[PDB]
Amino acid sequence: GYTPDEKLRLQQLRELRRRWLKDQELSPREPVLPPKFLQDGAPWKNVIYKTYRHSIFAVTHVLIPVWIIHYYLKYHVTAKPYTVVERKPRIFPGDTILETGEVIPLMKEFPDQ
Amino acid sequence: MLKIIIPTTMLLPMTWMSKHNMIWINATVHSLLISLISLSLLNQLGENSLNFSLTFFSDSLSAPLLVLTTWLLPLMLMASQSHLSKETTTRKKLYITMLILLQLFLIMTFTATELILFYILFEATLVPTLIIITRWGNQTERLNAGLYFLFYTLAGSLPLLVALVYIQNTTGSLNFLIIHYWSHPLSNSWSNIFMWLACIMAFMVKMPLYGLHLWLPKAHVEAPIAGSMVLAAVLLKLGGYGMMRITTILNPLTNYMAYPFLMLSMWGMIMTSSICLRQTDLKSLIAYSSVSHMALVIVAIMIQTPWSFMGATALMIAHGLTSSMLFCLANTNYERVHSRTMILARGLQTLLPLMATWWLMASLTNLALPPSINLIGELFIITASFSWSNITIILMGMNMMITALYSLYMLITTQRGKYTHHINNIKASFTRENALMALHILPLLLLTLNPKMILGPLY
Amino acid sequence: KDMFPGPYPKTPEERAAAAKKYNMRVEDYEPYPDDGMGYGDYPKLPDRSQQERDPWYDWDHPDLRLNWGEPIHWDLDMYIRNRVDTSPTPVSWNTMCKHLFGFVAFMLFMFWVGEIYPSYQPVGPKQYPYNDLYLERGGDPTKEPEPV
Amino acid sequence: SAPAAYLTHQQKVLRLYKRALRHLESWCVHRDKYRYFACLMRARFDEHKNEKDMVKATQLLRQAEEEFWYGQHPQPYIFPESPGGTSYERYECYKVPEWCLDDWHPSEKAMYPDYFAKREQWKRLRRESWEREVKQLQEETPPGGPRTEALPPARKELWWHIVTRPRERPM
Amino acid sequence: PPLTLEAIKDRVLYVLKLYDKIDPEKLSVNSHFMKDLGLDSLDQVEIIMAMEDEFGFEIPDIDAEKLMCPQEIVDYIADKKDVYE
Amino acid sequence: HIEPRYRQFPQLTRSQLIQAEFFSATMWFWILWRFWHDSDAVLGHFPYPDPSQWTDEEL
Amino acid sequence: KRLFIIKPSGFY
Amino acid sequence: SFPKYKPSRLATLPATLDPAEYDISPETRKAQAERLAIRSRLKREYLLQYNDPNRLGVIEDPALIRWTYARSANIYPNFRPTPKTSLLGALFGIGPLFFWYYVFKTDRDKKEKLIQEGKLDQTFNISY
Amino acid sequence: MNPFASLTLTTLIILTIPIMMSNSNIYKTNLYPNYVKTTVSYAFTLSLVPLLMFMHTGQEMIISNWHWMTLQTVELSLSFKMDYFSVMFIPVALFVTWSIMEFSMWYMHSDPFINRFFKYLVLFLITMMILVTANNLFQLFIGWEGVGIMSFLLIGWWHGRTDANTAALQAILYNRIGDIGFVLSMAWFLTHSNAWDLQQIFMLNNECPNMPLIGLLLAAA
Amino acid sequence: SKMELPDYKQWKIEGTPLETVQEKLAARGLRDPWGRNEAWRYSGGFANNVSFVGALLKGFKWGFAAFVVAVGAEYYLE
Numbered sequence A: 001g002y003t004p005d006e007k008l009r010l011q012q013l014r015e016l017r018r019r020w021l022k023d024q025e026l027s028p029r030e031p032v033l034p035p036k037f038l039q040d041g042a043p044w045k046n047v048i049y050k051t052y053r054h055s056i057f058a059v060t061h062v063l064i065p066v067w068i069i070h071y072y073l074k075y076h077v078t079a080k081p082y083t084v085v086e087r088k089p090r091i092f093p094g095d096t097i098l099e100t101g102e103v104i105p106l107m108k109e110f111p112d113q
Numbered sequence B: 001m002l003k004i005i006i007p008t009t010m011l012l013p014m015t016w017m018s019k020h021n022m023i024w025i026n027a028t029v030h031s032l033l034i035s036l037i038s039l040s041l042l043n044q045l046g047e048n049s050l051n052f053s054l055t056f057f058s059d060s061l062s063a064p065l066l067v068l069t070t071w072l073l074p075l076m077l078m079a080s081q082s083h084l085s086k087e088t089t090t091r092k093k094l095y096i097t098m099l100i101l102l103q104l105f106l107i108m109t110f111t112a113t114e115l116i117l118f119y120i121l122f123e124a125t126l127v128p129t130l131i132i133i134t135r136w137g138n139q140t141e142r143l144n145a146g147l148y149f150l151f152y153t154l155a156g157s158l159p160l161l162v163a164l165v166y167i168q169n170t171t172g173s174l175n176f177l178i179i180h181y182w183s184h185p186l187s188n189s190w191s192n193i194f195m196w197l198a199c200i201m202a203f204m205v206k207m208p209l210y211g212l213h214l215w216l217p218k219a220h221v222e223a224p225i226a227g228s229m230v231l232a233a234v235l236l237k238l239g240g241y242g243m244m245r246i247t248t249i250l251n252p253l254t255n256y257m258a259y260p261f262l263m264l265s266m267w268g269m270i271m272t273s274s275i276c277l278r279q280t281d282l283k284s285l286i287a288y289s290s291v292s293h294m295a296l297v298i299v300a301i302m303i304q305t306p307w308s309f310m311g312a313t314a315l316m317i318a319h320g321l322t323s324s325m326l327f328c329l330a331n332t333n334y335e336r337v338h339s340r341t342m343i344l345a346r347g348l349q350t351l352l353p354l355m356a357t358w359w360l361m362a363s364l365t366n367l368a369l370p371p372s373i374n375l376i377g378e379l380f381i382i383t384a385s386f387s388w389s390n391i392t393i394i395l396m397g398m399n400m401m402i403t404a405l406y407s408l409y410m411l412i413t414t415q416r417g418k419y420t421h422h423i424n425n426i427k428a429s430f431t432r433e434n435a436l437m438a439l440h441i442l443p444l445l446l447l448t449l450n451p452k453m454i455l456g457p458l459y
Numbered sequence C: 001k002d003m004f005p006g007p008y009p010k011t012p013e014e015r016a017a018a019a020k021k022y023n024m025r026v027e028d029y030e031p032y033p034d035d036g037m038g039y040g041d042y043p044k045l046p047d048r049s050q051q052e053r054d055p056w057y058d059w060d061h062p063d064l065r066l067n068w069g070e071p072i073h074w075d076l077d078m079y080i081r082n083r084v085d086t087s088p089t090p091v092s093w094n095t096m097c098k099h100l101f102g103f104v105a106f107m108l109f110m111f112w113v114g115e116i117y118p119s120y121q122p123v124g125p126k127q128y129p130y131n132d133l134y135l136e137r138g139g140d141p142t143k144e145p146e147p148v
Numbered sequence D: 001s002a003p004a005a006y007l008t009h010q011q012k013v014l015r016l017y018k019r020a021l022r023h024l025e026s027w028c029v030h031r032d033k034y035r036y037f038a039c040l041m042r043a044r045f046d047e048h049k050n051e052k053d054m055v056k057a058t059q060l061l062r063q064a065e066e067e068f069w070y071g072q073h074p075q076p077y078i079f080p081e082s083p084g085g086t087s088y089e090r091y092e093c094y095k096v097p098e099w100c101l102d103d104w105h106p107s108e109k110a111m112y113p114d115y116f117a118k119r120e121q122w123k124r125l126r127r128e129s130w131e132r133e134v135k136q137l138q139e140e141t142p143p144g145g146p147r148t149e150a151l152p153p154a155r156k157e158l159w160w161h162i163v164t165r166p167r168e169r170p171m
Numbered sequence E: 001p002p003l004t005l006e007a008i009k010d011r012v013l014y015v016l017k018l019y020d021k022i023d024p025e026k027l028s029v030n031s032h033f034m035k036d037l038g039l040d041s042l043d044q045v046e047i048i049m050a051m052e053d054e055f056g057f058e059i060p061d062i063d064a065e066k067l068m069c070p071q072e073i074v075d076y077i078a079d080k081k082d083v084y085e
Numbered sequence F: 001h002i003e004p005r006y007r008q009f010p011q012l013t014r015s016q017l018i019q020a021e022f023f024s025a026t027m028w029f030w031i032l033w034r035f036w037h038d039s040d041a042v043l044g045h046f047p048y049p050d051p052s053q054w055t056d057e058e059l
Numbered sequence G: 001k002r003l004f005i006i007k008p009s010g011f012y
Numbered sequence H: 001s002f003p004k005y006k007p008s009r010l011a012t013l014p015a016t017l018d019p020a021e022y023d024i025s026p027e028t029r030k031a032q033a034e035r036l037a038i039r040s041r042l043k044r045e046y047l048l049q050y051n052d053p054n055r056l057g058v059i060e061d062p063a064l065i066r067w068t069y070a071r072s073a074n075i076y077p078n079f080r081p082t083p084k085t086s087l088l089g090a091l092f093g094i095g096p097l098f099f100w101y102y103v104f105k106t107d108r109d110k111k112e113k114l115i116q117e118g119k120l121d122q123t124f125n126i127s128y
Numbered sequence I: 001m002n003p004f005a006s007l008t009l010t011t012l013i014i015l016t017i018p019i020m021m022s023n024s025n026i027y028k029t030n031l032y033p034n035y036v037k038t039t040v041s042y043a044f045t046l047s048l049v050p051l052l053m054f055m056h057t058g059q060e061m062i063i064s065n066w067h068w069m070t071l072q073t074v075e076l077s078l079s080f081k082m083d084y085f086s087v088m089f090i091p092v093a094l095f096v097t098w099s100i101m102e103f104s105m106w107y108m109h110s111d112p113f114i115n116r117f118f119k120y121l122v123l124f125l126i127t128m129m130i131l132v133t134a135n136n137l138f139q140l141f142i143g144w145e146g147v148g149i150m151s152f153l154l155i156g157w158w159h160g161r162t163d164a165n166t167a168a169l170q171a172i173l174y175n176r177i178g179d180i181g182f183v184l185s186m187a188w189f190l191t192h193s194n195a196w197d198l199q200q201i202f203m204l205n206n207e208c209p210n211m212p213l214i215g216l217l218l219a220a221a
Numbered sequence J: 001s002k003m004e005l006p007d008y009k010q011w012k013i014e015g016t017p018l019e020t021v022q023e024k025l026a027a028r029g030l031r032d033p034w035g036r037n038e039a040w041r042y043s044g045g046f047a048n049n050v051s052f053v054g055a056l057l058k059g060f061k062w063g064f065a066a067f068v069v070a071v072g073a074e075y076y077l078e
């Protein structure tokens, strides 16, 4: 059971608030200054984005790093010992490419499945 | 060098003769230049300590500190120059003189060389910082604070003084190089023990020790920020520098006398950090964080293992920059709202972003995470400490716990969360603010790339 | 002014000034009391983490959740939320403690009695079934020193 | 939004009812079983003492509180807006108070001429209004009782507080 | 669902209609709840919780005490959702 | 693109159901094809008591 | 657009 | 039901179970009327402060200042020596650090006797 | 071999670039995130290759391109061991995270600051890569702790409600408690084995280590 | 572009499991006013719960067949 004065209060504030929110709305009010702007717009004049965008993007992000980092590879690996240490390949009974060699052993095993 | 030191004197005439509304630019620009000149000193040598005049030398231990000390002046200027404005021109012009006079005493007291010269400057630093704390601090308590800052230094320093004189009588010269070479052990008895404390207590006061640190928070609560940045970032560290110096003598006695101070330190670190976890107001929180880190330096010095001195150097510098950074970064809030108490700031992030970013970087390196020079500085001394006693890790680990918490805490309490409603006072971040803290934090991050020039002599 | 907290509970007739001063006259004024901890003439308030106070009320400071001049609990910060929450719990406290600590206890003892009787070894009685394998021994004798 | 008032018995037993009923859904899960036990529950409240003297009744509450507290379920369902919430304040990151925009400086303020125009209209309305709420508040109030706010009588009515809260999901 | 005032008043009555104790023809947006209709509070709690439940919206208790007129309700949700429609 | 309804849930596009059903069927097709491709739930038999002649006992 | 967002000035 | 809740320092009893919530006398109702009176007094005040155009700046509430004051400046002037606090302070003070003193010193001695009189010294530990 | 070498390091490093682009105006655009999903896509495409060179011939690699700080005796240096584990694991992370990218573009599509959110995503993943790859133990520690703090930044994303903040703080707290053990171990290997490198430590510790393993276990906890 | 509300009248309770419940309350004689609301939208329309194991076998009806095509390919390879 609200007191009537409370009722009119809540009514008044409700009206004022809807008035506020209605005031909040914007129209063609969204705006911008004119917009180097030419440094971007001139480049877009001839680009064919549907394929070319993926082109340039991939060009940078995958082509440049590998060229660079591999050049850095000739730096650090050619420069110094133990910069890169391989596990050295397993060598089975089959001949090495280094100089033939290698041999199978016994093969005394019998029966199957 | 005598070359860097003259211009530092020369700014004073320049300050006084500067046009009344241009002085900040003068002092700023030339202080930056002289910083860059200071930087050339850094080269050092891999073997012999660098030398100059008969009366100066530049050990690797001093050089990064010297570079830092030269580096701070512009920063304090950028912080100060809006904090004060309504002050009369003659008084302001009087004011920066305190700062520069101060750093002049620092550039002199780092390169030493005689330990009596080093002492007299070591104690000479006390005056300008006193004047600054007392005349330009806010609120009443600063008066009282002045006294605590003062006597705790002198009561420590004075016996050291007499002790110094004594040695140059019991041996030849007081000079550092020869005493590094002519050094001979002092041992047990009882006279030699009092010699020990006499040559340690002053240095262990000036970088606060847990049983004696009481003046330090109560200094930082009071001092105008330009006083705070120096009182935190530098003077502590210089006390550490001197204590690293005088340990050329002593031994083997240090092996026997380290224990009590290792207890006050190893326990005081966890303790003060714990107090740090529940402050009422931020400006103190930072201060106790500072003591909580200096304890690490002081054990790092006393276990005397080379790793420990490496870590000593690194942590001294890193904590320098990060602490000063937190202070200016707190003063900004204090100016925007005059709250001081941390609770009123509340949702400061909501109303402005970039400061939240600096809060993030700064606190983030306060907790020390890799590969901050703070961290790497700290990990070494944990290593050497662990060599010294396998148990010790259980203490260090707790530190690394709490220093996380309160650090993040100061972040999440004064930022993340709701804005206070009525506090309309905030006004969207000046350029100088961002400029300033960017100036703290960038060097701190570049510096990680090249530790090898900061680790110091025992590298 | 005089608004700042004043020393010592021991103001039996002057207590009214104190109760007024913190804005809580209704003899809710509770000094800690005189004691050597040295905090005196400050209201002792019941412990209550801020969750306990009503969320739906429109507080002046909703995160702090504690309007305006209302005197603040001493250990505000420990109860500030994000810290200790002393909210009431449907199962009683001691029962909580007993159930969990007892649970971990049983968990451990059962565990270690388990450790006494490994699989493929066990208590001998069950071991009559549990026995198996042995098996593990192998390797060329060289492996005894190929690892050496 | 209807502050205070020292509490009374009826509303008390009512809130106990909505509460218990809700936890009862939290148990019964299915709309079905929940419906059944709900009807059974209200049936309990009426079948018991829907009318009685007070002194017995409070005892009946003291019974009910226990009987509830035992059955209250470790965690009730809670709507996200509610203080439990899966998102009690997810959006408080966003609700910036209006006065803060009043700071953008002209190069930004130019970009929304309309909104700012309307806004100065408002701020004008307030600064014009305020003395009236002063005199009225001064008027309707006795020394100053438990009640909060007071009715409009000819204009305005302490409105700036509520009317310009930053809605609910600003972003 | 950007939602509108008509949608609120409509969905609300659309729930009040289904409640048995109300006789649907007598229902009106302004129709009173106790002085008109004998539903009493013990059922009032039902209609309010069941009604908020439709939205997933939550009703604070002291505001639940007022309630009564359905228009007061649609007003209330209009405030909390800030529809301004 | 979809409308709220108030009970109907206008389950847009058959293609959705086509996809869902496609993956469920894809699942069973895999588990079964793999079940026929091999029975990995078994391999080689094992036994216990064996024969005393293989071991030792004498008397 | 349709409705005005509030937001602190981001210019500085 | 039977079991009954048992309140603790970390689990304060819910308000619904508090006996004081029930028994109620008109003077106690005057207590609630009073509490609402002062609470309404102050909140009315805070609203008069909160929103008139001319304030602009922050307005700190006095109670918070009494608190921050009482978390620092007021602690010492009171104090009082009391044997409970004094002994408790000696305990938390000198105690644990003596504890650590023995705990480190023994280990040090142990490593001493192993490095010297013994020969269990670590190898490779050339870093130092 | 060599192509494998350039390969893995590329399958890491390209991830860094968008963060760099974070100061570029494209970051301020709505357009940014799809460059990120595409970025992880290329990252994965590249990421498969080392696994296959790892397949049929089975080779494994360590590189330590640049010493960072030469101490006495010890000279720690960043070193990306690329064993079975580290090679196999990367495509997985790239894969699922790429799916998370595409998901998040829709889950958050209403949300402001979404671009920042993606920035934090990549920023997290890269630290994860720091952890899985690192040979030198210290580098494992930077990957460790950094992943921890990214966890903190993301848990608190809805920073308004307190519960998010407590959750974040809670996570950093227990992680830190683990970090104590991590540091204990990390010191002990240096004091004893004199190392901080998996080569050193695997080599010199045929003897039983009675204690470092348990603290390291706590860190694992 | 508001969607219309369906209908007040149309939500019959008779087909619902809930009707059984109202019967059970009728055994108590108790009245359960809300059911026509609760049951309407949920149980009473599209609702017709899918079997659990049947839900698990959502793809089996086609998968077994494509599998038959697969083994058919097996014999075809023979």
Ligand SMILES: CCCCCCCCCCCCCCCCC[C@@H](O)O[C@H](CO[C@H](O)CCCCCCCCCCCCCCC)COP(=O)(O)OCC[N+](C)(C)C
Pocket: B211, H081, H082, H083, H086, H087, H089, H090, H092, H093, H094
């Ligand atoms: C670096 C960290 C510092 C840690 C803490 C520093 C020292 C704390 C311990 C303080 C030492 C003792 C002083 C404490 C007060 C004693 C004097 C007096 O004020 O205390 C009386 C009461 O205190 C007790 O009588 C004294 C107990 C003292 C025992 C503690 C000593 C612990 C040893 C500490 C180490 C000592 C240093 C040795 C070198 C390592 C109260 O006076 P009063 O009210 O009028 O009369 C008594 C009232 N009666 C009759 C009702 C009882």
